[PDB]
Assembly symmetry: D4
Homo-oligomer: 219 residues x 8
Amino acid sequence: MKIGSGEKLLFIGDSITDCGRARPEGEGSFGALGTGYVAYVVGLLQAVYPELGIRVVNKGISGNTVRDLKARWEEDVIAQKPDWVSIMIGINDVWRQYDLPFMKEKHVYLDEYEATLRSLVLETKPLVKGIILMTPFYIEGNEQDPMRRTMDQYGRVVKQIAEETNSLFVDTQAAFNEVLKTLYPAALAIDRVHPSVAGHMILARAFLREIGFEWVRSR
Amino acid sequence: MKIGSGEKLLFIGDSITDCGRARPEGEGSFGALGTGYVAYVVGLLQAVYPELGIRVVNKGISGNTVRDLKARWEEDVIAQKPDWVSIMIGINDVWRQYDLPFMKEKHVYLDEYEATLRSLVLETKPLVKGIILMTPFYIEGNEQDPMRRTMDQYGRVVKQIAEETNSLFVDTQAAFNEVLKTLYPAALAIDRVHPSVAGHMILARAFLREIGFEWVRSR
Amino acid sequence: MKIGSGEKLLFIGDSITDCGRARPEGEGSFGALGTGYVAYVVGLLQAVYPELGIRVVNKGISGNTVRDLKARWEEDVIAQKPDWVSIMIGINDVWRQYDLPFMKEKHVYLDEYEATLRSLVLETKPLVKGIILMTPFYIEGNEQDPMRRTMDQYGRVVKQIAEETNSLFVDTQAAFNEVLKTLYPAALAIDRVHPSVAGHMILARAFLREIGFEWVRSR
Amino acid sequence: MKIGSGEKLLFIGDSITDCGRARPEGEGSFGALGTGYVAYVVGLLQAVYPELGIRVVNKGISGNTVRDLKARWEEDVIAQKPDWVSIMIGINDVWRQYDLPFMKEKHVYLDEYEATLRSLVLETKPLVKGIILMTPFYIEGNEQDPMRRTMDQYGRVVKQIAEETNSLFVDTQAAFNEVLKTLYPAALAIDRVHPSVAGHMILARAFLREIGFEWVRSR
Amino acid sequence: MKIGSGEKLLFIGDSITDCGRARPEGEGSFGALGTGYVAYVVGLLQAVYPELGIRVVNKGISGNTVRDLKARWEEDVIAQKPDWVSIMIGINDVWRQYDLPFMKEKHVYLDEYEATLRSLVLETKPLVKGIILMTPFYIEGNEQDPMRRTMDQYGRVVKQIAEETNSLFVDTQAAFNEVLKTLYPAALAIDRVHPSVAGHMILARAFLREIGFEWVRSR
Amino acid sequence: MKIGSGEKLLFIGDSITDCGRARPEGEGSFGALGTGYVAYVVGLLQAVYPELGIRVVNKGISGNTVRDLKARWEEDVIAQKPDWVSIMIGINDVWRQYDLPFMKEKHVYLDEYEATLRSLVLETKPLVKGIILMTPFYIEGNEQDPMRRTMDQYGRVVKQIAEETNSLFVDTQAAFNEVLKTLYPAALAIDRVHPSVAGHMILARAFLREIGFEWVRSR
Amino acid sequence: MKIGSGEKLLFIGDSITDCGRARPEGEGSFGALGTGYVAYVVGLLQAVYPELGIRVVNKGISGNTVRDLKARWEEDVIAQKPDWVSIMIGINDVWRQYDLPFMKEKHVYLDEYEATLRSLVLETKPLVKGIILMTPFYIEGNEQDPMRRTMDQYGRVVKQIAEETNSLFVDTQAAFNEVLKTLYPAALAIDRVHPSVAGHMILARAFLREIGFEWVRSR
Amino acid sequence: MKIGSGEKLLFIGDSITDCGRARPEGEGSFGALGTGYVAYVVGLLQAVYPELGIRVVNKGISGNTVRDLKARWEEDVIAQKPDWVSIMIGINDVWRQYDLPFMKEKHVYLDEYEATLRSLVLETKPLVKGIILMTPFYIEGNEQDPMRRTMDQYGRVVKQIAEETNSLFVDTQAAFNEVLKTLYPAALAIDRVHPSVAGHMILARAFLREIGFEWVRSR
Ligand SMILES: [Cl-]
Ligand SMILES: [Cl-]
Ligand SMILES: [Cl-]
Ligand SMILES: [Cl-]
Ligand SMILES: [Cl-]
Ligand SMILES: [Cl-]
Ligand SMILES: [Cl-]
Ligand SMILES: [Cl-]
């Protein structure tokens, strides 16, 4: 378990992270953590490692791009003095290119995305024990579907950045791809982005695996 | 214009047709028709052919497959004594196979779909002045996506039944496919089924063209 | 098609234009465009000219007179940097004279109306590619009904102004008059102002015809 | 005062009479009567003739034609054992011909209207102490407007039936026509049917005058 | 009719006057005038004197004493530039003495009431054509009931003031007393203060009689 | 304490007893009892006699007269197999004579009231361990007010029936009358019927005293 | 009765005291006092000592610790100029240690609690006639349950402070303990803190006993 | 994994199982399963065993005891033709003895509980592929608390019935007891019954472990 006792773990990102969490503080309880992967992570950590006393904050905001995370970073991350920061961003940065293809300033293209996300990691890294970078995802099994293909480019940037900055790394697309060998996207997410409880469990498990969670602990 | 003065035109189908129409009666001019292609069709006919004196009934019901249509056909179609019946069904017949793949009783497979729709058309045809068969559709430009591929199969059945019964036919998939050369699905419908105003216009226009509507009447 | 690719088309006026659009920005989607003629115009443009990538903003506000448009012109029009501005105003300017006949300062009489609307066009014209002036209307077939007779005076001023300023021009009263040869006003609008979907289609079609829309495109 | 002590007075009609009255019972003093002319009539009688001890029932139902009145006449009128029955019906009988011109089954034409209303009056008359027949009305000052012209015809039928049956008669059209020499319809009722408080007062006053109400009692 | 053409008549007082009127302007329509005696007055004036074009404003506020009227007089009366001001206040000034008998600073005793109401009349009188002073009331027939007995003291002060300042005068208690010879208070007002439509008609008629209203006009 | 361990105590009456209790069951500890004297009685018994193990059912219904009690007596009382039945009825029996004086069928006059209540008590008495008869009341200190005078008459009937049947008796009027030496009715109940918390306490205390409750248990 | 005529009694504490009272003033009526022990106290005082004319204010706020009371003391207590202050605090100070055991700064430990509560009493005492200190409580009969055991430590501090400062003193835990010899906590409070009406009566009675209330007065 | 491909798994129980599931059908993937352990179980199975193709039905109903289960067993279990039935019942059977101790008919004592649950298991077992019996639980670490002591007794019955019938068994009490070595109940469930997300995870994990779930599949 990478996370130590008494430490503060802060999650930020878009609606997948937000999942209706309490604004502004996103702590004090679960209703406050929302009803998606963040809550599930915290539930499983408390169920299996109750003695850890990990404090968890949810700063997701629906609709955010990486450009939006930067604009609120000081107040919503730095000022919170987290020990661990998990970031999952990029869905909107890409989605806007496909749902509003003629409003191009709402689009965050890959080179701006890369430099901005890099900037967040570099700023934060000296201040925390660790960073976990989760890739964005798109629940679509065809690598050549345009939005899937773009999403994968963004996820490769995330992985680049995690390697270079020694951050932890969760390939959420890889976790979905495995399930997509069986299920058509509709069975997980009608809009290919916002998943069922099952999709949130896919995400939570992928995050827990990267931080060394054990489903049945050995010592 | 295939529809002639004084006639009663009855639309039946699923949510795409329903679009919040008034239940049970579904008529006429002031919101009972719902807020999608059916209301637009009726709007445009009134704007351009006010003297036709057409009455219009919306018997769409959210969720319906062709099995559901059969179960209420006597009360919602035959007992309304329509002159013209337009049918657009198959989206749920297909979609349940993909979004609830293990709930097989909810699925209406091609054999049930062909036999049922054929039977409804054959029985209705001598009771009415004419039938318009609209294909189902899926807003997805990749013919090899599995749900699009199945939807196209269901559409072939509709086309074949219309030819065999000398019904009017609207290929709604072809109408979307034209726009999908420019737009990714997300620009028209986040779930690839329930479209924007623009998608409802694609549908209304495809319906109108088939019934001989003119935007500006030539004579 | 007068409107070119990537251009911004801004609609302003009263409740007929507003039709419940999102405040303040009236863009980002259709819910944002409201549910009347503006939305229908945008739907039809996207259905038939999806490659245009026209951006459309709705600045209608319910209850407005031309005196109200002027008071918000800088923020709601100039600051938006539109390429095309469509104006439809005058219904309230006239209606107040008939529903509050003893509150005369709520009335905008024809000479103030003319100079004010002229002032808006002259200010705007150097800043945009084009202006479309739509007349007000009153859904009433008797030319001698007092409010109809006043409305027609205002519509003649609009046409004057469009001619003199080389603006495009939509005679909405003419479009309604044709339909009123068949339908009594009640069938279109119970208050003779706020129309059914059919009346909104009358308006949208009249606007589309003036900007060179083709229902089936020729090249 | 034609109404005498201890008597039960029952008003029936459409929305103009209903005005949100309590269903099914429609009585008595604290809001069950609704918020239009019926409540005003009852108010004024109580203010000026408190000792009359009149009981009042409101059986108005929004939407009703005379066909609808016939269908519930036994339960809503005869079974209430009223002493006096006031009827105001015909607005919807007529209006449906104009607002839904192609839905002919919703229309109640003059032959059905005369025969039905005649029959209801003839049957009720020997069961009760008296009947008050109020004309329908349309708030429109042009006798040649088509709906006003039809409404006036329906009113003649009411007048002729009242004379033939020695019923009291209130000409509600004449009462509006007097005010319409000063005001355009929009100042009293935006849809020309559902009036302001002032219109309900016009109605209440016309009713009261016919039953021999005095504003200040002479003796 | 004391009130002349085009003049502005402003009503102020407590909940009996307010009766749910629109804040802050209490004009522009009837919903804006609330649903009690003020609205009825305006309805009757418009029904019988539509050509007068009287503008009517309602500044009642629920819970007010005369101490509250003074605190808002400049903004809610003077600044409105009325031609006629009707005041009805004193119910709360007295009620507080009986429902909160141990919170004595919420009480406005008769000498403060008198001087304050006098001060309002004297301030206003040079600025307007006329003032109408309506007494408070208490719907209770026993002169010796403590609250009735106090209310009557306040009403005698009102009458004093009207005489001395040449204001018009409406004894609302006298109008209720007459009806209370027949009806127990419960039949008019369950709390002996807030009346039924009948009680509001009692009030409206008493006001109309004092300003010279004619139920059927003679010239 | 007249009520003994393990017994079921059932309260029936009108709104004073109801006070928003759960329908139909009306039991037990967590809000089903409503928010007036019945809940307070049950609260205090539990606070001071927790070991008594008393079960309590609230069958009060807003609006009821003794006629209404008779109509549901079999299902709401006899079929509950109570040990003790407390009845408080008569307020509406009387009040309808005053608030709806001309709706005579709603009135339950003294002959119907005595005969009915007598009959209910006689029939119930051998089926249960005991009966508590509570008078109705009116919060009005003037014995010569007409509704108070009638209420006192109805209370005499209750007292006489309790004596004749050896029922326990609570004179609720006497309990209010004591407080009314200090307070005007408005301090306890604006409508003279529905009291504050303090009035419900007056009632609860009067009930408790009659059943031998001790505030501090002597032994 | 310790409390004298015309005096102001102010209650402060957490949700047990607040019980939905009106913010900010918590006076003017009962709705304003909320629906728990404070309201019951006031009801019983008014029922039995109506002539006292005691003014009662409720400043409870849900969630408060003693640290929260101090932060609002000047505005919510001192500025109110009470004659008597009742304080009940400590439930949250302790609860946080058990429901958020890893957010230790939300915890108020016993030495901070003691000094803070002492500080409130010492500040206030010169300004008022009297102070009543109510212990916190926990509805749990096992003295060795951890939260019960902590609560008792806090209650012993309260008693210490009351003795040293000559404050009145209510041991709410003692009052509950007696009832807990019969009832399991669930029957009083599902969360062992927020009680039923019965628990609120336990509290109100314990407070009334300490201020010398008599259930039936002797002079 | 004890559950095998294509099978239907049906969960029944009380609120812990219900957790707001869709009534009556309780299936499948998009919210119909509710928001507690059942949805989590289904989520995790899908994340880790998507190919199993398991269908899941939630027939939990808030409030139920085993008596309630018997009454709807035919329609809610047998008629669903499940392959696997999981039962978790006993919490209310027990809790009613403690929260409503004097309402003995609401209690289901050990004899009724054993006989009923035994009978339901014996009857169901030959109709289905397998049964999973989950104990009830109480989140309370003191074995000598009276409700915990009774709950443990009911759990022994469940364990004994599962052994006798060769059912799978989940000891939910043991799963909570492990976490209760660290946390006081209030950190998991304020009422000791309805847990947080973390408690639902404790339950889901205990269920999954018993059916042979692997967090990471070995082969
Ligand atoms: Cl988002
Ligand atoms: Cl659908
Ligand atoms: Cl408007
Ligand atoms: Cl109507
Ligand atoms: Cl008031
Ligand atoms: Cl009642
Ligand atoms: Cl609290
Ligand atoms: Cl439950």
